[PDB]
Amino acid sequence: AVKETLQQMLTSDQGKKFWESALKDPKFAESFAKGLQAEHEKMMRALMKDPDYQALMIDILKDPEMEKAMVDVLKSKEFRQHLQKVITETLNSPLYQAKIQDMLMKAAEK
Amino acid sequence: LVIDQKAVKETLQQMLTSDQGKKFWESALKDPKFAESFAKGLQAEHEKMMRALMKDPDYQALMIDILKDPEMEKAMVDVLKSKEFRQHLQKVITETLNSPLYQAKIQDMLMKAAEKV
Amino acid sequence: VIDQKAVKETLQQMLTSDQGKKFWESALKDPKFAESFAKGLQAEHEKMMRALMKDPDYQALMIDILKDPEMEKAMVDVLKSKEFRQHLQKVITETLNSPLYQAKIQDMLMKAA
Numbered sequence A: 001a002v003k004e005t006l007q008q009m010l011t012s013d014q015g016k017k018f019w020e021s022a023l024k025d026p027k028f029a030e031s032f033a034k035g036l037q038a039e040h041e042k043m044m045r046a047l048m049k050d051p052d053y054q055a056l057m058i059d060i061l062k063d064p065e066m067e068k069a070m071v072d073v074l075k076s077k078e079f080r081q082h083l084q085k086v087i088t089e090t091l092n093s094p095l096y097q098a099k100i101q102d103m104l105m106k107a108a109e110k
Numbered sequence B: 001l002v003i004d005q006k007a008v009k010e011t012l013q014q015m016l017t018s019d020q021g022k023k024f025w026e027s028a029l030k031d032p033k034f035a036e037s038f039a040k041g042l043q044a045e046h047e048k049m050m051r052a053l054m055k056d057p058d059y060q061a062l063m064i065d066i067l068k069d070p071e072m073e074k075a076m077v078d079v080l081k082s083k084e085f086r087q088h089l090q091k092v093i094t095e096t097l098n099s100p101l102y103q104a105k106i107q108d109m110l111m112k113a114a115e116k117v
Numbered sequence C: 001v002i003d004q005k006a007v008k009e010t011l012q013q014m015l016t017s018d019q020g021k022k023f024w025e026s027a028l029k030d031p032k033f034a035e036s037f038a039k040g041l042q043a044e045h046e047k048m049m050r051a052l053m054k055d056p057d058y059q060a061l062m063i064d065i066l067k068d069p070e071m072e073k074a075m076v077d078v079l080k081s082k083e084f085r086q087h088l089q090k091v092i093t094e095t096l097n098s099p100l101y102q103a104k105i106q107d108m109l110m111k112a113a
Helices: A002-007 A013-022 A026-047 A051-061 A064-074 A077-092 A094-109 B002-015 B019-028 B032-041 B043-054 B057-067 B070-080 B083-097 B100-116 C005-015 C018-027 C031-040 C042-052 C056-066 C069-079 C082-096 C099-112
Strands: none
Touching: A002 B002, A013 B019, A013 B032, A026 B032, A026 B043, A026 B057, A026 C005, A026 C018, A026 C031, A051 B057, A051 B070, A051 C042, A064 A077, A064 B070, A064 B083, A064 C056, A077 A094, A077 B083, A077 C069, A077 C082, A094 B100, A094 C082, A094 C099, B002 B019, B002 C005, B019 B032, B019 C018, B019 C031, B032 B043, B032 C042, B043 B057, B043 C042, B043 C056, B057 C056, B057 C069, B070 B083, B070 C069, B070 C082, B083 B100, B083 C082, B100 C099, C005 C018, C031 C042, C056 C069
């Protein structure tokens, strides 16, 4: 008897419309989430190693907010030493210094 | 209601907690509107999970691996070469060339170019 | 049996029980069930991750991650790439060929005369 009623209540588009309503109540949803939590966490860790999920995360990480956070680290005082180092190396190349010399000869020429 | 409290709990311990329950969820979640509703109800707890994972050093280490992907290296390279970042790069380059060391080297290089020219 | 209040309250008790947890443990071991769960929830998961990046509390965590020694090293290694070194030569050349700098160079020349 009871198997009949709950059959047309939690099984097809009925159940599909039933869960939609029950989960609008955040206490029901909290209890639903609680039973799933451990397994949801395990899956979210596991997906970090899957290439299709990595492609989603890579997309997310190119968001303007992450680009801004990256640019702030790059522009930080702590990171300035690293930028100076490659600038110093670039200027200290004898090949590059030859090009600077060419330009200084052209300025002295005029 | 004792006899019918038993029927309901036993029914739903079979319905939504065995083979039957599993099949329902597997189809419904392919419907992108029911998945929206479902994620919506669960959004609060999902946010808690993702925030907590970002504080977890094991999870952080996995995120670092993805940030080190060649695709993210390419993204960073583009940022470094952007017209935006160019102005900061110019400031660092300008402060270097303007330093007394480089001012001296350039003045020295320049007197050579003039001593030959 | 009021389809709502009553049963909802029963199923609510069952959803945080150990048998509820055992349902999710067993369901999510079936790869097809896991795939449908993951791909089904994907759109909203993305929205959650992008939205969270707009929160200063969460920005602090991503900043902590980017300042990790391993990330610092990766970022420095990118600075050292041929490609970045070539960009950097170009920016230096443009700054040296600048009217500002060309003018100091001519100020150095006359000053030596």
